[PDB]
Design an enzyme around this catalytic site. Structure first.
Site, PDB file in Angstrom:
ATOM      1  N   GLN A 270       0.775  -1.177   0.024  1.00 15.82           N
ATOM      2  CA  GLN A 270       0.122  -0.194   0.012  1.00 15.82           C
ATOM      3  C   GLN A 270       0.855   1.221   0.020  1.00 15.82           C
ATOM      4  O   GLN A 270       0.555   2.299  -0.631  1.00 15.82           O
ATOM      5  CB  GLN A 270      -1.054  -0.129   1.344  1.00 15.82           C
ATOM      6  CG  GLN A 270      -2.152  -1.116   1.232  1.00 15.82           C
ATOM      7  CD  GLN A 270      -3.204  -1.230   2.143  1.00 15.82           C
ATOM      8  OE1 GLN A 270      -4.376  -1.484   1.536  1.00 15.82           O
ATOM      9  NE2 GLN A 270      -2.938  -0.804   3.449  1.00 15.82           N
TER      10      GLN A 270
ATOM     11  N   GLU B 157      -1.094 -13.365   0.286  1.00 12.14           N
ATOM     12  CA  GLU B 157      -2.701 -13.344   0.184  1.00 12.14           C
ATOM     13  C   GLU B 157      -2.988 -12.309  -0.859  1.00 12.14           C
ATOM     14  O   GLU B 157      -2.285 -11.533  -1.180  1.00 12.14           O
ATOM     15  CB  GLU B 157      -3.288 -12.854   1.561  1.00 12.14           C
ATOM     16  CG  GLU B 157      -4.707 -12.568   1.679  1.00 12.14           C
ATOM     17  CD  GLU B 157      -4.787 -10.919   1.585  1.00 12.14           C
ATOM     18  OE1 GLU B 157      -4.277 -10.254   2.284  1.00 12.14           O
ATOM     19  OE2 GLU B 157      -6.133 -10.692   1.189  1.00 12.14           O
TER      20      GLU B 157
ATOM     21  N   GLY C 235       3.262 -11.122   9.306  1.00 12.94           N
ATOM     22  CA  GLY C 235       3.989 -12.175   9.063  1.00 12.94           C
ATOM     23  C   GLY C 235       4.641 -12.320   8.032  1.00 12.94           C
ATOM     24  O   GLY C 235       5.546 -12.867   7.861  1.00 12.94           O
TER      25      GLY C 235
ATOM     26  N   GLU D  56       3.337  -8.375  17.236  1.00 14.00           N
ATOM     27  CA  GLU D  56       4.425  -7.448  16.248  1.00 14.00           C
ATOM     28  C   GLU D  56       5.640  -7.299  16.833  1.00 14.00           C
ATOM     29  O   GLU D  56       6.667  -7.579  16.135  1.00 14.00           O
ATOM     30  CB  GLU D  56       3.680  -6.062  15.803  1.00 14.00           C
ATOM     31  CG  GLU D  56       2.230  -6.390  15.109  1.00 14.00           C
ATOM     32  CD  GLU D  56       1.721  -5.101  14.472  1.00 14.00           C
ATOM     33  OE1 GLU D  56       0.380  -5.057  14.166  1.00 14.00           O
ATOM     34  OE2 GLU D  56       2.566  -4.283  14.170  1.00 14.00           O
TER      35      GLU D  56
ATOM     36  N   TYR E  41      -4.855   4.216   6.943  1.00 13.22           N
ATOM     37  CA  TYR E  41      -3.670   4.080   6.276  1.00 13.22           C
ATOM     38  C   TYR E  41      -3.320   4.660   4.920  1.00 13.22           C
ATOM     39  O   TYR E  41      -2.302   5.142   4.654  1.00 13.22           O
ATOM     40  CB  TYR E  41      -3.822   2.506   5.775  1.00 13.22           C
ATOM     41  CG  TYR E  41      -3.755   1.606   6.848  1.00 13.22           C
ATOM     42  CD1 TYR E  41      -2.642   1.507   7.781  1.00 13.22           C
ATOM     43  CD2 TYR E  41      -4.347   0.307   7.039  1.00 13.22           C
ATOM     44  CE1 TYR E  41      -2.657   0.651   8.773  1.00 13.22           C
ATOM     45  CE2 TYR E  41      -4.164  -0.716   7.994  1.00 13.22           C
ATOM     46  CZ  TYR E  41      -3.199  -0.422   8.853  1.00 13.22           C
ATOM     47  OH  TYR E  41      -3.140  -1.399   9.768  1.00 13.22           O
TER      48      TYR E  41
ATOM     49  N   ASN F  57      -0.112   6.952   4.405  1.00 15.36           N
ATOM     50  CA  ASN F  57       0.703   6.536   3.358  1.00 15.36           C
ATOM     51  C   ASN F  57       0.880   7.621   2.352  1.00 15.36           C
ATOM     52  O   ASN F  57       2.287   7.848   1.680  1.00 15.36           O
ATOM     53  CB  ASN F  57       0.203   5.176   2.436  1.00 15.36           C
ATOM     54  CG  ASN F  57       0.017   3.996   3.520  1.00 15.36           C
ATOM     55  OD1 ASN F  57       0.655   3.671   4.368  1.00 15.36           O
ATOM     56  ND2 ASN F  57      -0.713   3.099   2.757  1.00 15.36           N
TER      57      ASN F  57
ATOM     58  N   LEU G  53      23.082   4.150  -4.963  1.00 15.61           N
ATOM     59  CA  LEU G  53      22.519   3.405  -3.909  1.00 15.61           C
ATOM     60  C   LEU G  53      23.882   3.430  -2.792  1.00 15.61           C
ATOM     61  O   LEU G  53      23.605   3.771  -1.607  1.00 15.61           O
ATOM     62  CB  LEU G  53      21.928   2.178  -3.954  1.00 15.61           C
ATOM     63  CG  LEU G  53      20.740   1.963  -4.699  1.00 15.61           C
ATOM     64  CD1 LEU G  53      20.252   0.556  -4.761  1.00 15.61           C
ATOM     65  CD2 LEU G  53      19.557   2.871  -4.010  1.00 15.61           C
TER      66      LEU G  53
ATOM     67  N   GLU H 277      26.154   5.640  -2.376  1.00 22.09           N
ATOM     68  CA  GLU H 277      26.414   6.811  -2.013  1.00 22.09           C
ATOM     69  C   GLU H 277      25.551   6.969  -0.568  1.00 22.09           C
ATOM     70  O   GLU H 277      25.995   7.824   0.290  1.00 22.09           O
ATOM     71  CB  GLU H 277      26.217   8.265  -3.093  1.00 22.09           C
ATOM     72  CG  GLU H 277      26.985   9.260  -2.532  1.00 22.09           C
ATOM     73  CD  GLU H 277      26.637  10.480  -3.475  1.00 22.09           C
ATOM     74  OE1 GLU H 277      26.317  10.249  -4.588  1.00 22.09           O
ATOM     75  OE2 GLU H 277      26.433  11.492  -3.049  1.00 22.09           O
TER      76      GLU H 277
HETATM   77  N1  LIG Z   1       1.867   2.792   7.662  1.00 21.22           N
HETATM   78  C1  LIG Z   1       1.245   1.885   7.173  1.00 21.22           C
HETATM   79  N2  LIG Z   1       1.242   0.781   7.805  1.00 21.22           N
HETATM   80  C2  LIG Z   1       0.581  -0.350   7.650  1.00 21.22           C
HETATM   81  C3  LIG Z   1      -0.224  -0.363   6.306  1.00 21.22           C
HETATM   82  N3  LIG Z   1      -0.760  -1.567   6.122  1.00 21.22           N
HETATM   83  C4  LIG Z   1      -0.416  -2.310   7.492  1.00 21.22           C
HETATM   84  N4  LIG Z   1       0.404  -1.606   8.285  1.00 21.22           N
HETATM   85  C5  LIG Z   1       1.115  -1.919   9.550  1.00 21.22           C
HETATM   86  O1  LIG Z   1       1.754  -3.138   9.242  1.00 21.22           O
HETATM   87  C6  LIG Z   1       1.674  -4.031  10.305  1.00 21.22           C
HETATM   88  C7  LIG Z   1       0.948  -5.316  10.140  1.00 21.22           C
HETATM   89  O2  LIG Z   1       1.437  -5.866   9.044  1.00 21.22           O
HETATM   90  P1  LIG Z   1       0.939  -6.080   7.445  1.00 21.22           P
HETATM   91  O3  LIG Z   1       1.834  -5.503   6.518  1.00 21.22           O
HETATM   92  O4  LIG Z   1      -0.547  -5.598   7.338  1.00 21.22           O
HETATM   93  O5  LIG Z   1       0.854  -7.459   7.578  1.00 21.22           O
HETATM   94  P2  LIG Z   1       1.553  -8.475   6.231  1.00 21.22           P
HETATM   95  O6  LIG Z   1       2.903  -8.123   5.759  1.00 21.22           O
HETATM   96  O7  LIG Z   1       0.463  -8.444   5.042  1.00 21.22           O
HETATM   97  O8  LIG Z   1       1.695  -9.948   6.978  1.00 21.22           O
HETATM   98  P3  LIG Z   1       0.437 -10.823   7.081  1.00 21.22           P
HETATM   99  O9  LIG Z   1      -1.074 -10.463   6.629  1.00 21.22           O
HETATM  100  O10 LIG Z   1       0.544 -10.880   8.630  1.00 21.22           O
HETATM  101  O11 LIG Z   1       0.520 -12.074   6.160  1.00 21.22           O
HETATM  102  C8  LIG Z   1       1.037  -3.043  11.490  1.00 21.22           C
HETATM  103  O12 LIG Z   1       1.895  -2.434  12.341  1.00 21.22           O
HETATM  104  C9  LIG Z   1       0.429  -2.370  10.706  1.00 21.22           C
HETATM  105  O13 LIG Z   1      -0.373  -0.931  11.386  1.00 21.22           O
HETATM  106  C10 LIG Z   1      -0.133   0.672   5.615  1.00 21.22           C
HETATM  107  O14 LIG Z   1      -0.995   0.555   4.487  1.00 21.22           O
HETATM  108  N5  LIG Z   1       0.489   1.914   5.962  1.00 21.22           N
HETATM  109 MG   LIG Z   2      -1.560  -9.478   4.945  1.00 17.14          MG
END
Ligand SMILES: Nc1nc2c(ncn2[C@@H]2O[C@H](COP(=O)(O)OP(=O)(O)OP(=O)(O)O)[C@@H](O)[C@H]2O)c(=O)[nH]1
Ligand SMILES: [Mg+2]
Ligand SMILES: Nc1nc2c(ncn2[C@@H]2O[C@H](COP(=O)(O)OP(=O)(O)O)[C@@H](O)[C@H]2O)c(=O)[nH]1
Ligand SMILES: COc1ccc(N(C)c2cc(=O)oc3ccccc23)cc1N
Ligand SMILES: [Ca+2]
Ligand SMILES: [Mg+2]
Lengths: 54, 334, 437, 428
Positions: C15, C71, C144, C183, C224, C228, C252, C254
């Site tokens: 994202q 996923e 994860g 986390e 989010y 973002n 990179l 540098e």
């Molecule tokens: N800044 C920001 N943080 C995000 C976003 N989506 C998820 N997070 C953060 O990422 C962490 C959760 O991990 P995700 O990246 O959603 O999980 P994933 O890597 O898809 O792993 P699983 O779904 O567990 O397989 C949390 O701390 C969320 O707050 C986003 O769009 N922006």
């Molecule tokens: Mg996920």
């Protein structure tokens, strides 16, 4: 105070300003760890399946 | 219900402060390690400032200023005075001082020692008290610690009756807004032994703190003269007040020390807030000149004053941030 | 010209990736269909922007980007969204089941099964490159997939591209927007495994960004999307030197030279100003002095911590907009007299400065106001170790009871990896202490 | 992980099960015939989790209906949403289980179990990525309890890498059919501790007390009990069924809620508490929802939350409200009552919001707690078990089906082990 490495172009400029002077695992080992982990999973599963067989 | 934790056990000031907080019935004490506190009364060392102000829904406040050890350690105070433009080597109210290691400004120390040899004035220095440099430099290396040599004050103000030495302890509270609050009650920590110029094979005659005295208790309860009496004395003996002769200088020194480090320690735009109670130790010479001896970062109070001071801590440091359902401080203005 | 491949791993990585590439298109005048009217060499070229975009014979400009998630639903939104035509379907890689917030599942179980396919798709972008300089890797610490798959991928990229630089953009976990109670486990596990494999990592604490959005954008409950768009502004500031003509941070290599003298201490603090709400009816534009001064306020940092109580090893200022060297140097001289800035004894006290005259681009209808000048400061300060201390303490709290450990052991991970990861963090916290006090 | 396979076993299982399908079908705009008739697209986005697209734009919710008697399943078939179920998914014997766990698990149930597993397999084979299973049953009878736990064991053997989730109705002397319920429940708990990942403890004691003390129903029927169950069940599956920030599933629920594999018995809660038909017209303020959802009187397991500590909590708020106020209220509960939340699991309370309220409410809150106070439920069952067991009373109903005393001794010790495990974390 001293300004060095001044570079200029159409897009902008860069420079440095100094205030004071100073004073890996192989493809093999990876595959081993990943296969070792699978072997722990298969084992834990076989132990469950034997418990269910009892 | 505001919450608080207690992480210093040996602290008489904060034992009393928490005791008072509970007695309002608007403050809950939590377990030592519960993160979900409004207030931390922290440990004296390695306080985890890095873990404060990251709790959503909690305004957090701590009773120490991170970085305030710069003022409150013997060695780093000298460094701070010498190197800061606000104070300088020229500084009129801090004794001549040099930092010495046992493994540094040893060479620059004994160069000024020869100004005290050649154009011979008083050449007595504190480290413990000697007249001779070569006996001092041995004493440091033989103990294996970092310590400071300082010009010892050879003409102190001497109280009569008794021909006695004393130090002044001032309690200063710095709140979360960096208001500097001087507690109106100070204390003199007197010697009970008459002062002896020709003898430094000494202890009780020269060193003024409440412990290395317990002639004890003779002229006043536990070598403790308070401000009303000391003022009265200054009027009777010397035709002046405590305010004019001493306290103007004390207020100046306190403000100078604390304004100096304000940019390094202020919590103004920070995610947690700090307050701290300091104990400033002053020496007074015979011409009524004030000298800063040390700043203490974790001071105890004096028995008579615990109640009043600890209540003041609650009112101005704590309740100002966390309001519940005459003033004993002089505000040092800037 | 030397190409850079972007890798976006898991929900956060993906994202944030969407947001960054959206912004890159706007900055370079590339449309959602991939056309770039200003690009006069049709079908090829070696301009600065070609670092990030390849070109087809039809003049489609395509990101040197791979998106990977275990996923499908997040990448499915890229597949069907505004920018669907930009990316080749083979660049967008999904499994059918996620790592269930479990590092061990992302790294060992599900990772083992998709890794070769991802490396093959990465290989396809690398083969299109005349002189690949290396990788930009976006992921969360807390997910994860973001933790587990990333660390495996990083290990493998070191094997297959041993000479290439690897940079990270890493989302550090915050309880205000967290998804999982584990986390802290995932963060320590991924940091340990990734540490040797990353050259420079930019951490963004979701707590800092969340609070910046509340305080300066007046968003009550940042989503989010809000987070973002802000992150993508900071990333774009950081990468602008790779994408535009200049003489600072041009490759990179540098980044490491300028920001990382000690290889393990490779986490520069980013500070950004100004952040101004687009709904603010009346705004007085901020000067070079005001925006530069704001780089030294904790409230503007990507990680809340206190640089007055650590030492600096390096500092870059990256300006965008109406900024000339003389106003920078005047701002610096004043700031130096008011602020506690202390460098380590063995580094020059100084600033590397880069200016691009183009003011920041904002997303049309987004939350950020257009400003006449903006700055991103990158400082390698020991103070960032406060974040490691917070995270390690949370890890210790759960691990002392072995709370949740069975979910990791159940995936084939040994319990021993937890205390090894934690020892490495103990050593890292120690390194920062030696350098900084 | 997308598809859930739902199983309902025995009288209680099928009665709460039928109600669950009625309630969620309404929420997703699905009618008794399986035709969609709603207006919002949030209704269809994750409908695959339960419902399954069929012929001529129809929806066939993955549901298997199991009993050893035909009675209740005939009642389901003629009940309001009876037509919606796939006819081949009705799997029934004839002889009943006589409120006897041994009949369901060893004799009568063993005869029928393979037919159920054939239907289970057929449903799993249609799944892109099966998350796992949810079972509705009681623990006090013979079919839901004995045959239900037999099913669980067999499902684990054939799908050992899928999640097993139950809604398990615990017996109470206050709402009691037979004296053997504590036997059946203890035998069942032994199974649940080993073979489920997540279990909602729906306590008939609590449902009774909520109906009597709170809803002012002088004589609660099973139907009034079930009104509370189906609302809680709708609430707890909200995040599985509706797209939000979380995109939750059964495994992520387990990972985040269960710190130690055996401690997986959840106390659910609901606010506002409402009766059938009779419902009040004022919506709750977000502070009132938050206060009521955490109130012991709103919990569906008759345990005192102040008699223990919360390991983990999941809270779902439904309706249009301030998310800022939700966060502030949720943070406030924790900060105000911090001692009841274990300090060694940071941030152990998680909140989710869904815009779509349940039927007939503008605002609702659902509570899922993993509390060490749940030990009170198991102690209660254990005391009732030992009162009979010490004299071997009523045992011949079970030894007549081939069980030995030893098996009761083992199940009791395991349930007493579970109790002392909760006591461990309540103090540590
Ligand atoms: N800044 C920001 N943080 C995000 C976003 N989506 C998820 N997070 C953060 O990422 C962490 C959760 O991990 P995700 O990246 O959603 O999980 P994933 O890597 O898809 O792993 P699983 O779904 O567990 O397989 C949390 O701390 C969320 O707050 C986003 O769009 N922006
Ligand atoms: Mg996920
Ligand atoms: N909440 C609820 N409990 C029920 C219902 N029907 C039976 N029970 C309870 O379930 C237990 C008896 O099990 P039951 O399901 O009738 O037996 P089975 O058909 O052999 O599984 C007792 O504890 C009853 O109180 C119901 O519809 N709702
Ligand atoms: C204790 O921390 C958590 C507890 C549960 C969850 N997840 C994954 C949920 C899944 C679910 O099915 O329902 C929920 C309802 C509300 C909040 C969370 C969930 C996540 C965390 N971190
Ligand atoms: Ca071109
Ligand atoms: Mg019955």
């Amino acid at each position: 105070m001293e300004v060095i490495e001044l570079n200029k172009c159409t897009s902008g400029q860069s420079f440095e300003v100094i205030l004071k002077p100073p004073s890996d695992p192989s493809l093999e080992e990876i595959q081993k760890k990943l296969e070792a982990a699978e072997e722990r999973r298969k084992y834990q599963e076989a132990e469950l399946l034997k418990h269910l067989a009892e | 219900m505001y919450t608080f934790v207690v992480r210093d056990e040996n602290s008489s000031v904060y034992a009393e402060v928490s005791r008072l907080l509970l007695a309002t019935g608007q403050w809950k004490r939590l377990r030592k390690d519960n993160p979900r506190f409004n207030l931390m009364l922290g440990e004296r060392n390695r306080l985890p400032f890095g873990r404060l102000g990251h709790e959503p829904g909690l305004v957090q406040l701590v009773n120490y200023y991170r970085g305030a050890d710069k003022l409150c350690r013997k060695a780093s105070l000298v460094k701070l005075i010498k190197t800061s433009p606000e104070l300088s080597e020229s500084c009129t109210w801090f004794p001549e001082s040099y930092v010495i290691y046992p493994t540094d400004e040893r060479e620059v120390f004994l160069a000024a020692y020869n100004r005290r040899r050649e154009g011979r004035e008083g050449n007595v220095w504190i480290a413990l008290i000697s007249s001779e440099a070569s006996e001092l430099l041995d004493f440091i290396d033989e103990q294996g610690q970092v310590h400071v040599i300082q010009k010892y004050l050879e003409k102190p103000l001497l109280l009569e009756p008794g021909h006695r030495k004393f130090d002044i302890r001032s309690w200063v509270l710095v709140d979360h807004l960096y208001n500097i609050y001087l507690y109106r009650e100070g204390v003199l920590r007197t010697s009970s032994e008459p002062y002896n110029s020709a003898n430094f094979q000494d202890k009780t005659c020269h060193l003024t703190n409440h412990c290395i005295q317990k002639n004890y208790g003779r002229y006043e309860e536990g070598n403790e003269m308070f401000f009303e009496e000391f003022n009265q004395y200054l009027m009777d003996a010397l035709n002046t007040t405590l305010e004019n002769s001493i306290l103007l200088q004390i207020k100046h020194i306190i403000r100078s020390c604390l304004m100096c480090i304000e940019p390094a320690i202020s919590t103004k735009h920070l995610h947690y807030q700090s307050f701290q109670l300091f104990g400033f130790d002053f020496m007074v010479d015979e011409e009524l000149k004030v000298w800063l001896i040390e700043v203490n970062g974790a001071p105890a109070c004096a028995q008579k004053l615990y109640a009043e001071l600890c209540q003041g801590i609650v009112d101005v440091a704590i309740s100002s941030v966390f309001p519940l359902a005459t003033s004993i401080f002089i505000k040092l203005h800037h | 010209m030397r190409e850079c491949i972007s890798i976006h791993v898991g929900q956060a990585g993906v994202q944030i990736g969407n947001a960054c590439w959206e912004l890159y298109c706007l900055e370079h005048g590339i449309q959602p269909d991939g056309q770039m009217p200003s690009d006069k060499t049709i079908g090829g070229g070696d301009d600065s922007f070609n670092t990030f975009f390849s070109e087809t014979g039809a003049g489609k400009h395509v990101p040197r980007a791979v998106f990977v998630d275990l996923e499908p639903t997040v990448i499915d939104e890229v597949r069907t969204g505004t920018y669907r035509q930009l990316f080749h379907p083979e660049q967008l890689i999904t499994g059918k089941e996620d790592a269930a917030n479990n590092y061990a599942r992302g790294h060992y179980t599900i990772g083992k099964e998709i890794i070769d396919l991802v490396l093959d798709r990465i290989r396809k972008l690398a083969d299109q490159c005349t002189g690949l300089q290396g990788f930009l890797v976006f992921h969360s610490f807390g997910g994860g997939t973001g933790s587990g798959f990333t660390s495996l991928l990083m290990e493998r990229l070191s094997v297959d591209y041993g000479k290439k630089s690897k940079l990270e953009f890493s989302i550090y976990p915050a309880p205000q927007v967290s998804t999982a109670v584990v986390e802290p486990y995932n963060s320590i596990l991924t940091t340990h495994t990734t540490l040797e494999h990353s050259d420079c990592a930019f951490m963004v604490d979701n707590e800092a960004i969340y609070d910046i959005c509340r305080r300066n954008l007046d968003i009550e409950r940042p989503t989010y999307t809000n987070l973002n768009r802000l992150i993508s502004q900071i990333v774009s500031s950081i990468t602008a030197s790779l994408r535009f003509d200049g003489a600072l941070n041009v490759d990179l290599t540098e980044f490491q030279t300028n920001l990382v003298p000690y290889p393990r201490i490779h986490f520069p603090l980013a500070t950004y100003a100004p952040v101004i709400s687009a709904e603010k009816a009346y705004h007085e534009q901020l000067s070079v002095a005001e925006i530069t001064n704001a780089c030294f306020e904790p409230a503007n940092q990507m990680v809340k911590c206190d640089p007055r109580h650590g030492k600096y090893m390096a500092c870059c200022l990256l300006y965008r907009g109406d900024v000339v060297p003389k106003d920078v140097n005047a701002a610096i001289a004043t700031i130096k007299t008011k602020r506690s800035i202390q460098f380590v004894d063995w580094c020059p006290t100084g600033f590397k400065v880069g200016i691009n005259y183009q003011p920041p681009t904002v997303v049309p209808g987004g939350d950020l106001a257009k400003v006449q000048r903006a700055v991103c400061m990158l400082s390698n300060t020991t103070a960032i170790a406060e974040a490691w201390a917070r995270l390690d303490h949370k890890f210790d709290l759960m691990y002392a009871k072995r709370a949740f450990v069975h979910w990791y052991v159940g995936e084939g991970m040994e319990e021993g990896e937890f205390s090894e990861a934690r020892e490495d963090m103990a050593a890292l916290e120690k390194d920062y202490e030696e350098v900084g006090v | 992980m997308r598809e859930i396979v739902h199983i309902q076993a025995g009288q209680c299982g099928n009665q709460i099960g039928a109600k669950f399908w009625e309630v969620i079908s309404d929420e997703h705009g699905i009618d008794p015939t399986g035709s969609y008739h709603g207006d919002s697209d949030l209704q269809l986005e994750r409908i695959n989790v339960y419902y399954n697209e069929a012929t001529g734009n129809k929806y066939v919710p993955r549901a298997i209906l199991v009993d050893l008697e035909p009675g209740t399943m005939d009642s389901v078939r003629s009940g309001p949403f009876g037509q919606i179920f796939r006819p081949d998914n009705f799997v029934f014997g004839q002889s009943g289980a006589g409120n006897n766990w041994a009949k369901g698990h060893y004799t009568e149930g063993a005869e029928l179990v393979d037919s159920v597993l054939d239907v289970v397999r057929k449903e799993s084979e249609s799944c892109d990525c099966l998350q796992g299973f949810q079972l509705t049953h009681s623990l006090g009878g013979g079919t839901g309890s004995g045959m239900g736990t037999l099913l669980i064991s067999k499902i684990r053997e054939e799908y050992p890498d899928r999640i097993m989730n139950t809604f398990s109705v615990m017996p109470s002397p206050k709402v009691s059919d037979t004296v053997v319920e504590p036997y059946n429940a203890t035998l069942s708990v032994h199974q649940l501790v080993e073979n489920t990942d997540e279990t909602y403890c729906i306590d008939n004691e609590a449902l009774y007390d909520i109906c009597f003390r709170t809803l002012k129903l002088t004589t609660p029927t099973y139907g009034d009990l079930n009104h509370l169950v189906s609302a809680t069940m709708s609430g707890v599956t909200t995040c599985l069924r509706f797209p939000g920030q979380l995109n939750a599933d059964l495994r992520k629920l387990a990972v985040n809620m269960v710190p130690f594999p055996r401690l997986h018995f959840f106390m659910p809660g609901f606010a506002p508490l409402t009766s059938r038909g009779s419902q009040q017209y004022r919506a709750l303020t977000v502070p009132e929802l938050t206060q009521q959802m955490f109130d012991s009187k709103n919990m569906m397991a008759a345990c005192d939350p102040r008699h223990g500590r919360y390991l983990t909590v999941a809270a779902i708020f439904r309706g249009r409200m301030s998310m800022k106020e939700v966060d502030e209220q949720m943070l406030n509960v924790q900060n105000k009552n911090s001692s009841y939340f274990v300090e060694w699991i940071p941030n152990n309370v998680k909140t989710a919001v869904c815009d779509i309220p349940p039927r007939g409410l503008k605002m609702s809150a659902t509570f899922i707690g993993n509390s060490t106070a749940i030990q009170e439920l198991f102690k209660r069952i254990s005391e009732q078990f030992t009162a009979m067991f010490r004299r071997k009373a009523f045992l011949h109903w079970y030894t007549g089906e081939g069980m030995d005393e030893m098996e009761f001794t083992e199940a009791e010790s395991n349930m007493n082990d579970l109790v002392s495990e909760y006591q461990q974390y309540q103090d540590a």
